[PDB]
Design a protein around this ligand. Structure first.
Ligand SMILES: [Zn+2]
Lengths: 165, 184, 48
């Protein structure tokens, strides 16, 4: 079963190659220096149990297409981000590396296009987005002189506006 | 709702953090997304999302009451208050800047190079020579220093006009407000 | 506290800072508060 998780890691590096093609178990077992006997049969019982929960997708026919989000281009990034922001928002650090070129040229391809890449989440997360509408450039003195508490003065705001009216 | 609140909040994000701006935009749905559903969709850290939501709640933008039931954060975007909150924020701001302008016109006006002791314009009799004409300091008879800044030579300031202009988009958006709805 | 408010620091940071400020002021007024910690002089001697 551990050798099975190792095969999963192998097909993950296979994705990293980008030459992913419909395969089967025998060729992988050969290239990973392992044999084809009844041991392969019991580990294939385990492997079908895996096919019941293969978040790393291992289907029986034409398969292995793990990434739930997977396209490969700058136009691909643009359009997937577009449709997802029609859905509204999304993006994680793992999505690009699982879907596309190896974890470089992606922050680059993001900063290069009109997309001002959104890396606003935590140090290990990049919620990609392209922002079109203008965040109103406000002077920092105006940006933080705007800080007047008004934290719980609801009725007070009502009456104060009624006063200045 | 209407285009009023949409454009309003869209331009209101511009003041707070852009990390708060994405969360505000998520109000695209008024569906009152729950905190854990937000973790699924916004995916910001539970601590970061908590801080962001609390900061957005404090200024009376949104109101949240998770009931008990899995618990469901009663997310919202209270639009009726939103307009008044923005109006008061600019209302106080326009006041503070004009008061800062007027309060900046008062200064001692004089100094001595040594002894660095500003006096006042009123001290002219003490700080003067019947003969030499040059104003001389009291405990050091060696002053020549007039005014470090002469006066408001410029008009009121480029600061007040700069607020007027940089906020013309906000003024225009509140003109688009135009009280579309007379409801509570 | 002034710098935290200037920077717009975390609300909980400002709350704890205000709590400590209140503690310091109340302790300066009276160091014998009921059921509250005593402010030492870095040597175990309570301040007067
Ligand atoms: Zn002098």
């Amino acid at each position: 079963f551990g050798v099975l998780a190792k095969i999963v890691n192998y097909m993950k590096t296979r994705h990293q190659r980008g030459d992913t093609h419909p395969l089967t178990l025998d060729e992988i077992l050969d290239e990973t220096q392992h044999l084809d006997i009844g041991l392969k049969q019991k580990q294939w019982l385990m492997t079908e149990a895996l096919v019941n929960n293969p978040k790393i997708e291992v289907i029986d026919g034409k398969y292995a297409f793990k990434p739930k989000y997977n396209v490969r281009d700058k136009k691909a990034l643009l359009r997937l981000l577009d449709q997802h922001d029609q859905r509204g928002l999304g993006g994680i650090l793992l999505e690009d590396i699982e879907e596309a070129l190896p974890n470089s040229q992606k922050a680059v391809k993001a900063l290069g296009d009109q997309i001002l890449f959104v890396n606003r989440p935590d140090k290990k997360k990049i919620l990609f987005f392209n922002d079109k509408s203008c965040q109103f450039s406000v002077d920092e003195e105006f940006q933080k002189l705007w800080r007047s508490v008004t934290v719980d003065s609801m009725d007070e705001e009502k009456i104060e506006e009624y006063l200045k009216r | 709702p209407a285009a009023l609140k949409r454009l309003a909040k869209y331009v209101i994000r511009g003041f707070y953090g852009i990390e708060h701006a994405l969360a505000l935009d998520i109000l695209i749905r008024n569906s009152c997304v729950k905190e854990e559903d937000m973790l699924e969709l916004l995916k910001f850290d539970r601590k970061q999302l908590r801080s962001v939501l609390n900061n957005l709640k404090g200024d009376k933008f949104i109101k949240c009451r998770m009931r008990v039931e899995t618990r469901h954060n009663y997310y919202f975007i209270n639009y009726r208050t939103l307009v008044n909150v923005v109006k008061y924020k600019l209302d106080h701001m326009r006041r503070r800047i004009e008061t800062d302008e007027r309060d900046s016109t008062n200064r001692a006006s004089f100094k001595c190079p040594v002894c660095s002791s500003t006096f006042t314009d009123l001290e002219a009799n003490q700080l003067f020579d019947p003969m030499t004409g040059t104003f001389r300091c009291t405990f050091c008879h060696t002053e020549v220093e007039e005014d470090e800044s002469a006066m408001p030579k410029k008009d009121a300031r480029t600061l007040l006009a700069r607020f007027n202009e940089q906020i013309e988009p906000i003024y225009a958006l509140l003109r688009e407000t135009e009280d579309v709805n007379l409801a509570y | 506290l002034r710098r935290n408010e200037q920077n717009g620091a975390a609300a909980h940071v400002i709350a704890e800072d205000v709590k400590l400020l209140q503690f310091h002021v109340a302790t300066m007024v009276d160091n014998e508060l009921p059921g509250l910690p005593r402010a030492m002089q870095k040597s175990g001697r309570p301040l007067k």
